Symmetry: D3
């Protein structure tokens, strides 16, 4: 009966939803919801915009997370309090491998925990791993969209800048831990950087929740060509089509 | 002349070198309107950005979202655009029985229960505010008539297990955080929030001046889950006034 | 042309690029004989090596011994000899009440309670299998009629304190591991073994494809002493499964 | 009721709740004589203890020896005897080019390159001074006419490799500390000393007020191997005066 | 009365309280036959176990396999069966230019580059031998005419990256271990092997006496390919030495 | 040069390459006077420095103060002046019931509960004595007639919480140290002091020879007060022992 503190929704508001799609950007919430039936705005507070919709007759929540594990952890927790058990993350990513192209899609098979919030759920030795059904559904949905799909490891960083070894910054400095790190992850086969998967996957895998992450590649750190506008727009649309279809696969 | 997330240019800031950085995008306009000629600049994601004038000087107000990661983006991008001083305001849960709802806390150092701070400095580095900003915040807070506590803040990457909340879906907390609230209480830590460790470490190690003031809206010795906010933002604007040179 | 420990050459492998890597040297022949033309290659230390053919393709079977360190040597040396895909089968103790003796587990990620994984990637790197291998193992395991669990495996450098066993010489468990079985249980961890963290981390960070499948021999919430016929049936099914998983991985 | 190391009783302190804690036992009498009625109490090991009176109030002066471990014993045992406020004075090497020999530094937070701080709080906890003490030290240092810097201090369990000195027997520095001076410099750290991390962490986590002020006697951008000390103790006594009320 | 892996019972050990624990199963019989009435007890996995008699006292010889994890099992199960003293002999690669191939090393402490030691004691605990065992080993080593070095051994969960070997499948060494051989050299570390940290930490924290002696088979500052006659001489001497160290311990 | 803290020159040491390093400045003269021609060299801060002659050879006696940090300065500066061997003597609290006040402990390895050791070697590195110094100290200690224990010492940067003392101002002990005394006791640790981890790690990683010997004057497990005579005898015996250990180290 309670209204969760941050998301401002009740369990009844979710109309029985046990699955949530959790993009990063609040603006993307409506966009995902309208790919389903009967999208209804529930609430917007802070970075959390929440809609409900229906997919093959089943209630689905779409809720933005904001950037980063901390804000993601709140949304996932409060949704879980309200009965959500499956969380499908969709979000943009920078690829770091030359073979991954802008417009491709990555389904994370495990995340490098370059975050802090994951540690609030499990010690570092615990794997930031998706639920296998979710990863499988995301792969299938991504392939069916016509996308080129990569399964692999994602580096999930609490920062956009030094943790992704960006030097074009105010200080131009990167702390010792992250100096040379992009090359190290590249050499280790890591596909991409984003900022939420380690927290999400660790939290869920250690809490009896099913989670997975799919991402559209919007830049490649190894390509000094500017991503074409059309490809990006197409990638935006494809990513959310894919996550909704992955949700469909998870429901039945 | 652009930044990746904030959607504003250096020109948009009209020479501002100080930012007030609340967490909640909805607080941005409220803070801006406490100043002169507030102007909406941009809103994208958790980042709503206004400018206003305070004693004739441009000040930026920019929300951070919850947590170190989104905060770190805002601070970096504001710094790219010339901002050098960052005044954090927000709400907080006190963990000391003598710190009351409505009191204000000015953080003298943060327990780094975050990940992003480590992306700027190793854990041994202190998450401490710039002394002038802390001084200005204490003065603004005290001058307002508030009851003000200076001290250590536990700054957590989570709202729930890292602040040892149990009224949660799993109802459990990982080993590291079991008993942690009592430990911080024993150690004299005043309060929990989610951004100061990142902000203070990032800034103290990057030649930026930062500080945090917080309004206490719950006492965790009383209960787990929750006018103070209005008073806090008046205080931070006065702190900004004191920082203006 | 030579490796330091395995005592086999690239030529001995006859072009094999896939290895099945059980823990027990005695299991190697058993696995090899599920395939065509099994040939004993070498046995040195804990490394017994056979080759066989699966649908006309050479497959190597090589034991790892117990633990990440000896596993890491075998994987490295096999990789030097051209092996790129590693299918681990091994016995395991389940820790979840709902995971029954005789069930099978395919590891989706390992809790890195080992040291050797850190020699390949820092702790934040996930000990996760190659998705194709995990998919092949799940399919093989399910097709066999087994009850199959996908999930997290706690992978320990010890059998005793790191798996929170107290019935030991000292009866002591270091602080780090006191209460750890309950913690992993609460976190949904399915089982304990002693090699997957090393194997999965090493491979995932080295451009090698790896996965682990295991037959549940005991459940820690029940008894430590397995029933002989049950164990035998589980072990036989597990090696049939890993061979079919290899079949699925063949190109 | 005589503490294990310091060789004094609570009665010996005549109600003092403030201590000045230099490192060198020889400085103890020198600080004490800046106050009224200095009396020698005890000398054992590196711990020389005097009492004196400052504006009518009893103050203890107690040396710490070099390093967190010996400092921790002195602070603990003084605290057992009623001391609640600890003012550290000492010498320091600056690592910033703009900080000059003769300048003073008031530590706003310490990089915890020590071990004893961890015996009081985990590394995440900030080695930060009490704000009142830091404020009093700044004011006292300024009023002496000293050039004063507020900022972060790297506090090392060694004088040599932990301060990245190479003119040593081995001439080498362990991986952790190779390039560390430059890293701290880049992060805006002002100086190196050896006690503040322990002192500040211990006190901040134990309900004790502490701060550190230091006279710069060498600039490490200039050389490795090293009036400043006279003025420094004047300043710390004046900071003590400000703390009393 | 039984154990989980070694396949021997307390009765099988005939009251032995001392074990010689080589790494290689094939070395077990070679050690046992230097004593009286050697008898094969069991061979399961990497664990080959013999008993013999030394000056009228039963001694067990039990291989460990490679690595701390398999070693920890052997030590634990032997301790369950009454063994209290563990003498490790094994081959090693020296990293100091002044330590020659054919020299012997008695470990005075190990750099804990392993994971299993942490399952017995946190990292700050010293991986230290029992002083009587180290003393006996030094004496035995010296009496054999060997050139003997007492000092620190780096004990790695891997043979390859943890010993900073680059001539590998990936040719990569994780950041932690890049430059590590030079660091250990500069710190006076004598040699690398893969079990002593686990063994010494486990034993020193569990009321068991342990020590490690090793013959230098290669020097990393020289060549990786040992000369056969030199290697054979060194290995023969090492097992003679460890049996004499056992004699000294049992006196 | 005159070293910065110790205030002595190389010439002042008259060729000494061995130092006895007690903690307490007041103990320096007492040790020096057990030898021939004791000469006061300097006193600054916690560093009182004497020279004396032992069998015609110059020996330095230099106090360290309490704790690794001040110890590290003294060892470094003496090493700059040619000192290569460092014999630590002091008193200690035992934590094992079988260790009696008046017994002596020679440290075979230290639990690194300090910070300064990390400034010389990472935590994995063992805080272990030079074998010759430990051997000499054991011999000197046993020849004195004392009961001598060889074993692990817990070396703490604090006297209070790091030794799990609760009779303190806050009565609080941080999580890391709660239950730690029982843990070290169960791991066979003999005693607590506050310098050995730093000293041993520093020296063992820097090509310096060091060891520690200590007289037991308190036992944390015994609720009886040791009498004056015993304590006096123990203090005197400890320094007689360290000087005899120095004699044994002279070349
Ligand atoms: C392009 C890119 C996006 N992201 C994530 C961060 C934000 O959440 C979002 C937009 O930048 O996508 C990265 O983390 N790294 C990248 O290189
Ligand atoms: C009331 C309260 C707020 N906060 C902070 C974190 C977020 O920035 C914001 C909303 O929860 O306030 C806490 O961290 N803990 C609390 O108990
Ligand atoms: C039954 C069982 C096996 N194992 C693994 C370890 C060895 O690799 C092998 C033999 O015990 O199986 C465990 O790790 N835990 C268990 O509970
Ligand atoms: C000059 C100087 C002093 N100190 C401090 C530590 C001791 O407390 C004291 C003696 O060196 O002064 C440093 O740590 N570094 C320095 O460079
Ligand atoms: C020669 C050599 C052996 N060893 C150990 C590992 C194995 O246990 C055994 C065989 O290689 O000896 C090393 O660890 N490093 C070496 O350089
Ligand atoms: C009695 C005792 C002494 N010590 C050491 C610390 C000092 O160096 C010296 C005096 O207390 O002896 C301990 O560390 N613990 C003890 O229990
Ligand atoms: Cl998004
Ligand atoms: Cl806010
Ligand atoms: Cl409340
Ligand atoms: Cl097996
Ligand atoms: Cl001083
Ligand atoms: Cl200078
Ligand atoms: Cl061997
Ligand atoms: Cl002493
Ligand atoms: Mg660098
Ligand atoms: Mg618990
Ligand atoms: Mg059941
Ligand atoms: Mg069942
Ligand atoms: Mg030579
Ligand atoms: Mg030679
Ligand atoms: Mg506790
Ligand atoms: Na956010
Ligand atoms: Na001292
Ligand atoms: Na093995």
């Amino acid at each position: 009966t309670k209204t969760v503190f941050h998301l401002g929704v009740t369990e009844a508001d979710l109309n029985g939803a046990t699955l949530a799609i959790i993009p990063g950007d609040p603006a993307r919430v409506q966009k995902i919801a309208e790919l389903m039936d009967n999208p209804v705005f529930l609430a917007s507070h802070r970075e959390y915009t929440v809609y409900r919709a229906e997919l093959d007759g089943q209630s689905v929540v779409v809720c933005s997370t904001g950037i980063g594990g901390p804000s993601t952890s709140i949304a996932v927790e409060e949704l879980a309090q309200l009965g959500v058990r499956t969380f499908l993350r969709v979000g943009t990513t920078g690829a770091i491998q030359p073979h991954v192209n802008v417009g491709d899609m990555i389904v994370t098979t495990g995340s490098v925990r370059l975050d802090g919030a994951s540690l609030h759920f499990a010690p570092m030795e615990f794997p930031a791993v998706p639920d296998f059904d979710v990863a499988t559904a995301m792969k299938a949905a991504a392939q069916e969209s016509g996308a080129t799909v990569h399964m692999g490891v994602t580096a999930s960083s609490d920062t956009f800048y030094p943790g992704q070894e960006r030097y074009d910054t105010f200080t131009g400095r990167v702390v010792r831990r992250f100096q040379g790190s992009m090359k190290e992850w590249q050499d280790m086969g890591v596909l991409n950087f984003e900022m939420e998967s380690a927290t999400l996957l660790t939290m869920c895998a250690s809490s009896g929740l099913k989670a997975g992450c799919v991402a559209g590649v919007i830049i490649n750190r190894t390509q000094k060509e500017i991503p074409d506008h059309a490809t990006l727009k197409e990638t935006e649309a494809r990513s959310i089509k894919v996550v909704v279809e992955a949700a469909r696969k998870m429901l039945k």
